[PDB]
């Protein structure tokens, strides 16, 4: 292999491993103050015990932020829509009816995409990825090629399992993932290379498998291969388009000239560290005050020998003044520490969008003030997931669209369909529903002889901004509706008139009365 | 005070409804609804 | 990539910047159409009947 | 089959490279121990009183 | 064209005779510095306490 892949997948992984080390260090520091097990250190193993952080806002705001991001980015309602360019489409077909049929097909496609997302537990993996992005700012999502309708969950790579190199322009030049798969669990093609390499390995032996995705010099495309023991696996070679690469590296906070992203917790790690210091001291002061020490005055006359051997209700020589208890006298410092603890925890709660900010530490709270400031949390919600639509949502749809077309799970796209991820169809619903409410107001003036109601309906629809093609009935369709309406009375009046006359002839005479019987199969004599 | 403070944050982590009940003082029904929504949202995190 | 950004001692600046940028975004680029194409009414009427 | 094994091992909190999962309680066991210490001392004080 | 250049340099606060704009934050940076000083001292007093 030439270009970026000359050295090999494993060696590229080690050279870029040192570059990602500062991000791993920050992720471990960020995890330490929120949820230590979220980003464990490399040396951590089954015997590692993760201490509970001295303060709670870090873990609490971490869980809150990931769920709120998940709700906004991946709600139950469709969060992507397939959009066809309105002018280019109308240039290819001749009637608005087909254009609605085009939107029906696009609506079906995104229904299939969501059904595929739910049936493959993408929401489970996305929430794990979102938690990683808040503490580490980095996660790699791999979407395996779907084999039929089988369960195909996407693989999540933590920052410690992959490296990505990115130029200052922001292009992913190359990226290597490390998979530690047992010999038994290896796929056949990877296993054949391991046996082909030499040696007899136990089924439980761990194999380092490296997948190297690098930008090709020719065509500006991504070349992909899997390497084991420094040897490329036969059949692991492949090609992915630049915009449809299944390995998606997501950055929570992106800085120019940096290959990896920054985490959200890192922006507030200073507050968490200082709140950790205050919270630890406050709890440790309570541990001191928890100890009971009876201070006996040696200038006094009370003997603990008599006190401890006494029963309840016993009369004993002594004075209450000679017996005292060691107490922690730090209330002035305790109030200062608690005040700054509350002050930092309050602003950390707002930064983590915790509803303690609306709840406040104390005093009375009114409902209406909460709603307006709740909007502020929903507004600052917009800023935190803003690049996640471009970093995560949009490539996720692009890879899925190409993969589902390859497996024919969706029909082949017209090649002119664009997909925006909008928290779309709901916007068109609001426009349509406003038109009906505006139009329903025109019903009082239905019989008005002065105002051109058709003209007003067009202006109302146009001012809303909806596409007006086909909403107004054409002259031919108006003629058909009148004809269909006229036929309805024509058929209905005819059916009543015909049956009445037919009944009259059937009952005209007893002789014809028998004729009706023999016709239907009845018999006069019974 | 520290026992009430630790029990308060443990109550929120365990989805306990005493968290919205608070240590003391008066509460408002509409405010209780919003903070109870936060508990149900963080609830979704643990069974994901 | 090795630079550590210390959290500012006050939080209003980070809170203020995020709120301002978000509030500007809703005002300038909302979900509703924020630009309109307008044709000069007299000039258009001088061209169509 | 790999996908339809009747024996289902469930992990509450799964960590990379671990055969078993972590519990949810152990993330807050530190606060539980500290509250345990306070609650024991508070009750034992009442027993002296 | 002079009116349709794809490179758009945007200035938040425009001053006459200046090639670049001023930030909106710098209008209030003095109050941010003063509050930074107070917030640093308040936290550090708590650390002493």
Curated annotation (Swiss-Prot), chain A:
Record function comment: Forms the portal vertex of the capsid. This portal plays critical roles in head assembly, genome packaging, neck/tail attachment, and genome ejection. The portal protein multimerizes as a single ring-shaped homododecamer arranged around a central channel.
Protein name, as recorded: Portal protein
HAMAP family named among the record's database cross-references: PORTAL_PROTEIN_T7
Pfam name, any one: Head-tail_con
Taxonomic lineage of the native organism: Viruses, Duplodnaviria, Heunggongvirae, Uroviricota, Caudoviricetes
Sorted UniProt keywords: Capsid protein, Viral capsid assembly, Viral genome ejection through host cell envelope, Viral genome packaging, Viral penetration into host cytoplasm, Viral release from host cell, Viral short tail ejection system, Virion, Virus entry into host cell
Oligomeric and partner information: Homododecamer. Interacts with major capsid protein. Interacts with the tail tube protein gp11. Interacts with the terminase large subunit. Interacts with the internal virion protein gp14.
Listed GO biological process terms: symbiont genome ejection through host cell envelope, short tail mechanism; viral DNA genome packaging
Homology family: Belongs to the podoviridae portal protein family.
Compartmental location: Virion
GO cellular component terms attached to this protein's record: viral portal complex
From Swiss-Prot, chain C:
Highest taxon above the source species: Viruses
Oligomeric and partner information: Homododecamer. Interacts with major capsid protein. Interacts with the tail tube protein gp11. Interacts with the terminase large subunit. Interacts with the internal virion protein gp14.
Residue numbers of the full-length protein present here: 50 to 98 of 536
Job of this protein: Forms the portal vertex of the capsid. This portal plays critical roles in head assembly, genome packaging, neck/tail attachment, and genome ejection. The portal protein multimerizes as a single ring-shaped homododecamer arranged around a central channel.
Name under which the protein is recorded: Portal protein
Originating species: Escherichia phage T7 (Bacteriophage T7)
Subcellular localization(s) per the UniProt record: Virion
Similarity comment: Belongs to the podoviridae portal protein family.
High-level lineage: Viruses, Duplodnaviria, Heunggongvirae, Uroviricota, Caudoviricetes
